[PDB]
Amino acid sequence: ISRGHYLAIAADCAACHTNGRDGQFLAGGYAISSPMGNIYSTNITPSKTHGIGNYTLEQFSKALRHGIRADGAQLYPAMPYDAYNRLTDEDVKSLYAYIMTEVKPVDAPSPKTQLPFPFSIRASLGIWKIAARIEGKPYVFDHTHNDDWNRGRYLVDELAHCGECHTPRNFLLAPNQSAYLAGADIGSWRAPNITNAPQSGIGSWSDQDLFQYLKTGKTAHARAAGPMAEAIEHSLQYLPDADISAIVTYLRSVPAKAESGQTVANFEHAGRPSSYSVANANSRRSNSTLTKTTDGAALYEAVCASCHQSDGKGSKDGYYPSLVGNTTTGQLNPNDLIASILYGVDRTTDNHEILMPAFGPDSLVQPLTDEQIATIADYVLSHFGNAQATVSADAVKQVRAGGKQVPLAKLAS
Amino acid sequence: RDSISDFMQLSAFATGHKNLDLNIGSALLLAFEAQKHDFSTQIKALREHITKNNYQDVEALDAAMKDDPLHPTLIQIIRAWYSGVIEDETNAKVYAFEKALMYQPSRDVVVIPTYAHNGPNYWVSEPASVDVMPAF
Amino acid sequence: ETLSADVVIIGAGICGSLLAHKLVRNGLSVLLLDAGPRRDRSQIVENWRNMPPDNKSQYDYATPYPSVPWAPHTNYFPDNNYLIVKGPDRTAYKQGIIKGVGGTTWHWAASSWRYLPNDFKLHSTYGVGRDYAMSYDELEPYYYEAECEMGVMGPNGEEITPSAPRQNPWPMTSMPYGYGDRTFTEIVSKLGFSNTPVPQARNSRPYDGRPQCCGNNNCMPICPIGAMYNGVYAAIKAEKLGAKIIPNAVVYAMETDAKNRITAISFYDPDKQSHRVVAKTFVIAANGIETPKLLLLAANDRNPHGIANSSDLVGRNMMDHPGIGMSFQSAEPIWAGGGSVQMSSITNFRDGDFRSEYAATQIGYNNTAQNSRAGMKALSMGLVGKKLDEEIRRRTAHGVDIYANHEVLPDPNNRLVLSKDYKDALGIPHPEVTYDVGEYVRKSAAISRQRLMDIAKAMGGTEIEMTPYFTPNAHITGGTIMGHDPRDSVVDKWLRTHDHSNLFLATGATMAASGTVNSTLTMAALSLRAADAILNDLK
Ligand SMILES: Cc1cc2nc3c(=O)[nH]c(=O)nc-3n(C[C@H](O)[C@H](O)[C@H](O)COP(=O)(O)OP(=O)(O)OC[C@H]3O[C@@H](n4cnc5c(N)ncnc54)[C@H](O)[C@@H]3O)c2cc1C
Ligand code: HEC
Ligand code: HEC
Ligand code: HEC
Numbered sequence A: 001i002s003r004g005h006y007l008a009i010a011a012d013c014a015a016c017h018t019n020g021r022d023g024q025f026l027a028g029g030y031a032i033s034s035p036m037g038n039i040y041s042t043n044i045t046p047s048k049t050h051g052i053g054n055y056t057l058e059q060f061s062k063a064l065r066h067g068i069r070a071d072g073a074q075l076y077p078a079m080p081y082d083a084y085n086r087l088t089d090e091d092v093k094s095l096y097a098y099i100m101t102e103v104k105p106v107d108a109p110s111p112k113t114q115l116p117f118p119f120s121i122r123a124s125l126g127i128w129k130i131a132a133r134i135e136g137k138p139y140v141f142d143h144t145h146n147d148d149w150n151r152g153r154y155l156v157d158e159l160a161h162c163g164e165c166h167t168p169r170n171f172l173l174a175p176n177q178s179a180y181l182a183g184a185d186i187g188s189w190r191a192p193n194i195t196n197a198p199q200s201g202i203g204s205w206s207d208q209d210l211f212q213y214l215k216t217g218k219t220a221h222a223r224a225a226g227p228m229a230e231a232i233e234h235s236l237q238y239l240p241d242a243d244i245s246a247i248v249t250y251l252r253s254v255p256a257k258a259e260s261g262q263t264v265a266n267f268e269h270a271g272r273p274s275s276y277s278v279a280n281a282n283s284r285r286s287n288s289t290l291t292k293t294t295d296g297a298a299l300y301e302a303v304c305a306s307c308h309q310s311d312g313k314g315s316k317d318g319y320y321p322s323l324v325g326n327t328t329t330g331q332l333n334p335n336d337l338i339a340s341i342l343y344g345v346d347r348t349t350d351n352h353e354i355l356m357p358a359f360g361p362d363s364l365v366q367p368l369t370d371e372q373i374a375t376i377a378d379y380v381l382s383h384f385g386n387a388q389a390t391v392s393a394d395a396v397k398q399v400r401a402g403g404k405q406v407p408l409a410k411l412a413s
Numbered sequence B: 001r002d003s004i005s006d007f008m009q010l011s012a013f014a015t016g017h018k019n020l021d022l023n024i025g026s027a028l029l030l031a032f033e034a035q036k037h038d039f040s041t042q043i044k045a046l047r048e049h050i051t052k053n054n055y056q057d058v059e060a061l062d063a064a065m066k067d068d069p070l071h072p073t074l075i076q077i078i079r080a081w082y083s084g085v086i087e088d089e090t091n092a093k094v095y096a097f098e099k100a101l102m103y104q105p106s107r108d109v110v111v112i113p114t115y116a117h118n119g120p121n122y123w124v125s126e127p128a129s130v131d132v133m134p135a136f
Numbered sequence C: 001e002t003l004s005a006d007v008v009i010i011g012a013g014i015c016g017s018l019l020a021h022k023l024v025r026n027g028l029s030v031l032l033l034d035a036g037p038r039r040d041r042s043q044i045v046e047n048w049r050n051m052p053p054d055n056k057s058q059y060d061y062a063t064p065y066p067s068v069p070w071a072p073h074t075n076y077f078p079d080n081n082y083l084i085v086k087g088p089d090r091t092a093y094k095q096g097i098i099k100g101v102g103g104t105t106w107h108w109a110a111s112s113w114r115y116l117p118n119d120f121k122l123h124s125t126y127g128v129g130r131d132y133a134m135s136y137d138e139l140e141p142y143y144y145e146a147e148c149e150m151g152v153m154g155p156n157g158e159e160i161t162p163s164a165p166r167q168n169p170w171p172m173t174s175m176p177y178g179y180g181d182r183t184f185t186e187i188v189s190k191l192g193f194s195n196t197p198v199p200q201a202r203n204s205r206p207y208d209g210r211p212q213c214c215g216n217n218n219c220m221p222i223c224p225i226g227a228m229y230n231g232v233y234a235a236i237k238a239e240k241l242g243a244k245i246i247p248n249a250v251v252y253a254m255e256t257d258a259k260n261r262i263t264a265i266s267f268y269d270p271d272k273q274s275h276r277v278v279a280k281t282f283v284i285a286a287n288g289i290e291t292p293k294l295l296l297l298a299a300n301d302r303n304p305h306g307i308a309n310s311s312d313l314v315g316r317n318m319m320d321h322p323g324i325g326m327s328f329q330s331a332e333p334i335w336a337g338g339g340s341v342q343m344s345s346i347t348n349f350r351d352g353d354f355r356s357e358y359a360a361t362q363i364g365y366n367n368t369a370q371n372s373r374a375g376m377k378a379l380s381m382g383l384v385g386k387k388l389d390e391e392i393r394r395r396t397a398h399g400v401d402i403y404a405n406h407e408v409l410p411d412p413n414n415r416l417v418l419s420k421d422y423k424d425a426l427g428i429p430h431p432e433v434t435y436d437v438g439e440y441v442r443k444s445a446a447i448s449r450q451r452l453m454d455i456a457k458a459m460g461g462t463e464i465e466m467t468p469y470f471t472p473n474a475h476i477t478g479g480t481i482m483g484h485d486p487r488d489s490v491v492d493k494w495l496r497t498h499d500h501s502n503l504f505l506a507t508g509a510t511m512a513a514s515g516t517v518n519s520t521l522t523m524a525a526l527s528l529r530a531a532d533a534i535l536n537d538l539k
């Protein structure tokens, strides 16, 4: 592939500008659940009428790195232009060439983004950009480190923008560079700590495990779900092995950001040798549409034990992950576990599709209430994952709603 | 704790398998005691027979107790441990599924239905020999 | 109190739920009524797991689903007497049904089959049975629509000589065989029989947001993971789009005006409280058994013999696929249990010139795991110690179950009159079926038994046990037959009753021929055709 095509893949610029698996390529129309509402990706195909076909190199660079549209309107920071700001001029030119000459134009307008006041006006984004310290010089290599470290830093920060989800935001929804890659809540999902912290972060991960997780999303202790599954299946699985190795090299040098109340790594939680009782289920026969099944062990056995075995160790071939020693169950924050139960896992790598069925209200296999999901998650945490973590029905409801509402979103009421 | 320990030891001797679930054993003992009020006495008598005659395995005990009145109780214990039920009707209580001993001789090949074997296409592989008893 | 809607569908089975989903997708207001309750898949799984192993060895497909007294369904291990069967072949109509949101598709094997083009013109081709009101070409688009909606996998690149022609490939390709299916295919190929993959509404890959089939081998009576299709999926999708579902709604009466159009229907709740429902169009999608029962029970003064019974054909021409069961211990290991419970079947005798004389048949191999059967049989043998384990392993490795299903012609004396001796908690009479297999099926079985004997001998089977009677298969067709003449049929080619232009019967009772394979996919295709007719009528 061309250099511009590779840069577009690495930057994952198509995962958001394509509405979905059955959406037009780079045509926009994909809804991004921002804290203040839904922001829609715009048409990117070089359509001179409905896309960015009339963009010059300077206008395209401005839109990509400074969040300024062709007309001068400020782009919403759902655009990771705060990450693309430090892209090199050559990379921007290659991306522009790929967009103009290698993407077929699509003549179809995208839905307009309508945000509530005071976020309706895209002119206050100027001093928001000023307060976010977005501006910065184009990336240059740090001669103190080797080329692998520099390339990995470029991939992590500028292209793949891992900090967009893994670095927490401050009150003004700007990146908090003090807690670099320390973990963040990005809605219904939480991006965990991926610093070099041995217990809080991914410091205890083996290099092979980290490489395999980044390349495929599947590892004996961690599986990619939600936004990370999309990132892997749209960008990371197509990166060369050298790029993933460079990313791992840079990640191993990220300063550690410890979490409060952490003693062992997220994948180092042993499983309790406990389970449910078959005898206790006899009273629940002739009791269709389970409502009297309030036992967490019984609910887990009825709903989840088929794939993840009753001991929680999954299948022998590893297709069904072991809930014991799993980073999602072993997290002190049970956000990812609740999200996995609610929405399932769907990751397509190498044209082969993982699928966990969803178990939320909209489930086809087995809808579960907030109390049932909370009970199942509590059982999983106490027996297979972090015993110090707890789940309530209110937490499940909050995850369903799209996570905790940010304080800044209260202004639009 | 004496009754449950004796029942578990007799069950380990009778089924020929040491690894037996303690909770399943307790439930089976409670159900047996509810059904038969002198079950503890029969368990004790079977244990005295085993110790006095020094039966190495359940084969010898079964062969030497074909007409003894304690044979039905031993066969009932074996059936309860293997099938997971004690009665023989449709509303009989099930005390062990996926842990009942009759699913174990074929666990390495045959699926216990509502619990998955390893992966959504595992069956493309050749099965093991019938002459190799897996485990347990 | 009036419960108004554009279309009301009586019965939230696969047919009713698929029709409701198609209707709400096109902007119609739909009221979905079901006599049974809502059911949770995981609770049914837990009920099956705690069902006694003897009820797993012998295929009990009803105990995991509790029977509600107001709308009872058939159970046969206690053998409740909801469905009374008479006639020389009463055992061949002891059919299992499940009542609830989802219907009998809750516990089916999901063998989604397309009928052959000759199955729609059986009478015109062989001079036996009845012709369908529509041809295969007319139902082909609806066949494909149903296959895409339910996610049917099949042998995409493969030449099966007696197979329905396809304009499009299957949505999924058939998953690979287990050991038992491969061994059976080789054996019967040496025997001269063509063992071909069964098209199944099963996920050979993640489909419709549901997991790939992991070979739980429990398709009847419940999938723990939802890797196969259930009509509850269509019910859920319709409800999400605006369809109103009322469980425990036992419809018992229908009202007709001077033009014989249905103006309203009434249903009982579990406390026998009557609720009136008014709609622009009425659909009964209950069963091949429950639809004729409702039609006969709701007889008016304008319709003394039952609703849409001007031809005296409601409840007549009851059809199914009479089966002959076979069990034996194969000389060589078969290891049943790899994949779904029904992975392949012998489709060689689905068609031929012999169909003018005796019935075309389908021979199949049961892929249900034999561990429960082997364990119970070995425990019944009074074995002990290592001999017990060896016997269990040998019997689960060598246990084979073989069947042969036949095609029964529509006979007017195969009836579903209302029973005068039994009722339920709501006072509604129990259904009563008099079933005769007929000389057609008897002549077919005289050869099917020899074929099964040959299969057992080729496998070196011992302890051979053939059923001396005919077994049911729960493909309840006929009862409200379709055709062109109003004097000789109940509904037309659009599944609309001749008597009432307002009533549609989206059920398998409309099918004029039972065919040779499972008939629920044809039922779904006919329901989608009726959906098209309803949409044309109301717009
Ligand atoms: C064990 C088994 C295995 C099967 N395997 C296969 C297979 O492999 N392939 C295949 O094609 N078919 C198979 N079938 C057949 C299949 O289940 C049926 O053909 C299918 O369910 C079609 O049923 P239906 O939609 O007409 O109605 P159903 O789903 O049977 O019932 C619909 C609903 O009507 C409701 N109802 C009934 N009377 C009333 C009333 N008076 N008022 C209100 N609601 C009412 C019921 O409560 C029910 O929920 C199998 C059946 C069984 C029992
Ligand atoms: C029912 C009550 C449950 C609970 C509590 C969980 N699951 Fe599953 N799951 C399955 C597969 C294949 C995956 C990973 C995707 C892949 O590898 O392709 C998962 C994922 C999870 C996780 C997260 C693991 C991670 O590292 O992110 C958790 C916490 C989890 N599950 C718990 C498979 C299945 C099923 C297959 C038929 C069923 C049913 C379930 N899962 C249900 C549950
Ligand atoms: C959101 C827009 C993300 C982008 C871009 C990246 N990641 Fe991510 N990651 C994200 C989430 C929501 C999750 C967890 C999903 C869950 O099940 O809760 C993850 C997961 C990881 C992990 C595993 C850590 C763990 O599970 O404990 C690692 C090591 C990781 N992510 C690293 C990573 C890198 C190196 C990225 C770009 C170069 C990257 N992620 C992008 C959210 C998002
Ligand atoms: C990887 C290469 C990449 C290129 C090149 C790119 N984008 Fe965007 N982009 C947006 C959103 C949302 C807007 C509009 C926001 C606004 O108006 O402030 C936008 C706006 C633009 C615009 C302005 C044109 C217009 O009509 O608004 C251009 C040009 C653009 N993007 C190009 C979400 C994304 C996301 C989301 C995950 C990714 C990744 C992303 N974009 C990656 C890329």
Ligand code: F3S
Residues within 6 Å of the ligand: C202, C212, C213, C214, C215, C216, C217, C218, C219, C222, C223, C224, C225, C226, C227, C228, C339, C340, C341
């Ligand atoms: S039970 Fe389900 S997992 Fe497959 S074998 Fe049947 S569809």
